[PDB]
mmCIF file of C-alpha atoms in Angstrom:
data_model
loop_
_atom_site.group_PDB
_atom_site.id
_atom_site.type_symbol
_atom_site.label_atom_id
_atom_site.label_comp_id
_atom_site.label_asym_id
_atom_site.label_seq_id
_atom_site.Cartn_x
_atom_site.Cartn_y
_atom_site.Cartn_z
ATOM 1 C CA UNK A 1 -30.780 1.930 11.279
ATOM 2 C CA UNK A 2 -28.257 4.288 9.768
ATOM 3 C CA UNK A 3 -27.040 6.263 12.559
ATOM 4 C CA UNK A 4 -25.118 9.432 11.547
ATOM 5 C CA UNK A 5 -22.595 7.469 8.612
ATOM 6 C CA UNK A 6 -21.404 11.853 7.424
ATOM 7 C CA UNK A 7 -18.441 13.093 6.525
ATOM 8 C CA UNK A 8 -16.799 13.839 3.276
ATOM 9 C CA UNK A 9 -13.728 11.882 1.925
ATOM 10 C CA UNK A 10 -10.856 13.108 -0.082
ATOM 11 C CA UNK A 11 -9.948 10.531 -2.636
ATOM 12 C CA UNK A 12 -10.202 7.069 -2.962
ATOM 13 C CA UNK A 13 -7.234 6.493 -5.584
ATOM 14 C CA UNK A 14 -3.812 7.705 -5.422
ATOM 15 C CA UNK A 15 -2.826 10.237 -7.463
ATOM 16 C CA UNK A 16 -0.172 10.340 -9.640
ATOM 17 C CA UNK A 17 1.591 12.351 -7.170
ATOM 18 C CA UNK A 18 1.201 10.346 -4.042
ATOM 19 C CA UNK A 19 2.605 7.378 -5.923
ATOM 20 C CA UNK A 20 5.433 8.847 -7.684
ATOM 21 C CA UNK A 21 6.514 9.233 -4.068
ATOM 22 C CA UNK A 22 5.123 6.152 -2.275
ATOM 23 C CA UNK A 23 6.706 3.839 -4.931
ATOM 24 C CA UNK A 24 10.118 6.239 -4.332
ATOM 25 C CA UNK A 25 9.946 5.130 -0.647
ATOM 26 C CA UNK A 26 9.032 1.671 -1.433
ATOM 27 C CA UNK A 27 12.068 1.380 -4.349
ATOM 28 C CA UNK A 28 14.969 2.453 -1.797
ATOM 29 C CA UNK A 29 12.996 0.564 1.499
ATOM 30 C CA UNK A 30 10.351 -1.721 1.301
ATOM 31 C CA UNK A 31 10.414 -1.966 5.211
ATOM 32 C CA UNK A 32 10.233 2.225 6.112
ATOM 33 C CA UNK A 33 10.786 3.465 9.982
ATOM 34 C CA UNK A 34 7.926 5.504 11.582
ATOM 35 C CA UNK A 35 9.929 9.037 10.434
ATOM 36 C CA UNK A 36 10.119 7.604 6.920
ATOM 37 C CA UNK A 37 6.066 6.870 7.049
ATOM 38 C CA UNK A 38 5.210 10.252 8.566
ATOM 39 C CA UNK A 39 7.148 12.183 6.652
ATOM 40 C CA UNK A 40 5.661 10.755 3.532
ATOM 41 C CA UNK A 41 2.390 10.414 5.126
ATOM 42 C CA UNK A 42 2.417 14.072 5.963
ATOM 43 C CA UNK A 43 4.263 15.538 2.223
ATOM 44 C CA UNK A 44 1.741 13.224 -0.135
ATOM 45 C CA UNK A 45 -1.019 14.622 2.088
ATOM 46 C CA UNK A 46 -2.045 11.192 3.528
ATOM 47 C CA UNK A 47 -2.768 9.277 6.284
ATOM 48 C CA UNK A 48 0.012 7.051 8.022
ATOM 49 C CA UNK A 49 -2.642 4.086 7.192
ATOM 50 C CA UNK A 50 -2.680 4.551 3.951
ATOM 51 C CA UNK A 51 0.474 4.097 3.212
ATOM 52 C CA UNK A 52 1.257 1.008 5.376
ATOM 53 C CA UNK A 53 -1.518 0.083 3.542
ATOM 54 C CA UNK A 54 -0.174 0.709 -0.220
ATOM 55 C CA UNK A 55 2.739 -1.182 0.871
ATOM 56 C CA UNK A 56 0.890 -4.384 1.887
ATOM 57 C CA UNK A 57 -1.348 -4.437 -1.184
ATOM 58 C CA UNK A 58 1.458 -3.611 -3.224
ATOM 59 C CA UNK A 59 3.999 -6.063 -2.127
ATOM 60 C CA UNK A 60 1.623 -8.978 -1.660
ATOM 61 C CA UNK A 61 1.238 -8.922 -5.516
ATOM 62 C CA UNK A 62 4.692 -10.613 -5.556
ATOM 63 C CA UNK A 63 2.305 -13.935 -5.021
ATOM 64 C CA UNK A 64 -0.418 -13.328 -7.480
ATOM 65 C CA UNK A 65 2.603 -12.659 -10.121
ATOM 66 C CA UNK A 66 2.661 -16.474 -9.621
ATOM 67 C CA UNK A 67 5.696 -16.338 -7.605
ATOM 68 C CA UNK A 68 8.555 -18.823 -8.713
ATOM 69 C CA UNK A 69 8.112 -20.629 -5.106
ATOM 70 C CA UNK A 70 7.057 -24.350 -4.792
ATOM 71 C CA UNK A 71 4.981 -25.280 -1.573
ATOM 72 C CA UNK A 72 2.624 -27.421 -2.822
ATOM 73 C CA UNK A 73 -0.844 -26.236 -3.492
ATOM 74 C CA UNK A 74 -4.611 -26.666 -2.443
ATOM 75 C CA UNK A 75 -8.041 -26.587 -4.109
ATOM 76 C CA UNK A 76 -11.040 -23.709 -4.365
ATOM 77 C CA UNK A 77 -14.048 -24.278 -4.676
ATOM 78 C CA UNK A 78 -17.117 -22.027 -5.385
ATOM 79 C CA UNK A 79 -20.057 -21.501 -3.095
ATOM 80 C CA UNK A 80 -23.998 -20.643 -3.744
#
């Protein structure tokens, strides 16, 4: 049973803005310092998650641009 669940969120998506700085951060250092993600965090308008968030989905896409890396593989199957 539901209990409460309000509030009102601001975006889901990151606006041209937020990225055009995020991706600035993440161009000069992938790996920021707590000042680096608060500042940002706290110009962009967004919460220090977020970003260390951005940076993990972002980055981990080096592997699904089938990264030139061999390990050695594994199977995947579907389920019902």
């Amino acid at each position: 049973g539901s209990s409460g669940s309000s509030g009102r969120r601001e975006r889901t998506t990151f606006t041209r803005a937020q990225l055009d700085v995020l991706e600035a951060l993440f161009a000069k250092t992938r790996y920021p310092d707590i000042f680096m993600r608060e500042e940002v965090a706290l110009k962009i308008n967004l919460p220090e998650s977020r970003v260390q968030v951005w940076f993990k989905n972002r980055r981990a896409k080096c592997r699904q641009q089938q990264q030139q890396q061999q390990n050695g593989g594994q199977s995947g199957p579907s389920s019902g």
